[PDB]
Amino acid sequence: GPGSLEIKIRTTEGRTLTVDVKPDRTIEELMEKLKEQTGVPPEQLRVIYNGRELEPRTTLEEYNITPGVTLELKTRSSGHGT
């Protein structure tokens, strides 16, 4: 296998990020990386692979998050609470 893989994450800020992650990792990882990259809190975002919505609880291998792809951030405008 590749071990890890270099993907991209276009944000609600309109910028495209570029991080490397492993296919065995969860979307929680992707949300963690984009947080420390652009600064935006992932709890208010949705990761979008090639026009598909990705939940944090699910793995990368489940969505075929392969190297060279562009994930997008569509807003998740609903807070858990105060």
Amino acid at 41: P
49 and 31 Cβ atoms separated by less than 8 Å: no
Q: What six digits make up the tokens of 6?
A: 């270099």
Amino acid at 60: L
Q: List all residues 6 or more positions away from 46 whose beta carbon is below 8 Å from its beta carbon.
A: 53, 54, 73, 74, 75, 76
- C-alpha distances in angstroms, 75 versus 3, 29, 72? 30, 18, 10
33 and 60 Cβ atoms separated by less than 8 Å: no
Q: List all residues 6 or more positions away from 41 whose beta carbon is below 8 Å from its beta carbon.
A: 35
Residue 73 β-bridge partners: 47
Alpha-carbon gap, residue 55 to 42, rounded angstroms: 11
As its CATH architecture, domain 5-75 has Roll (3.10)
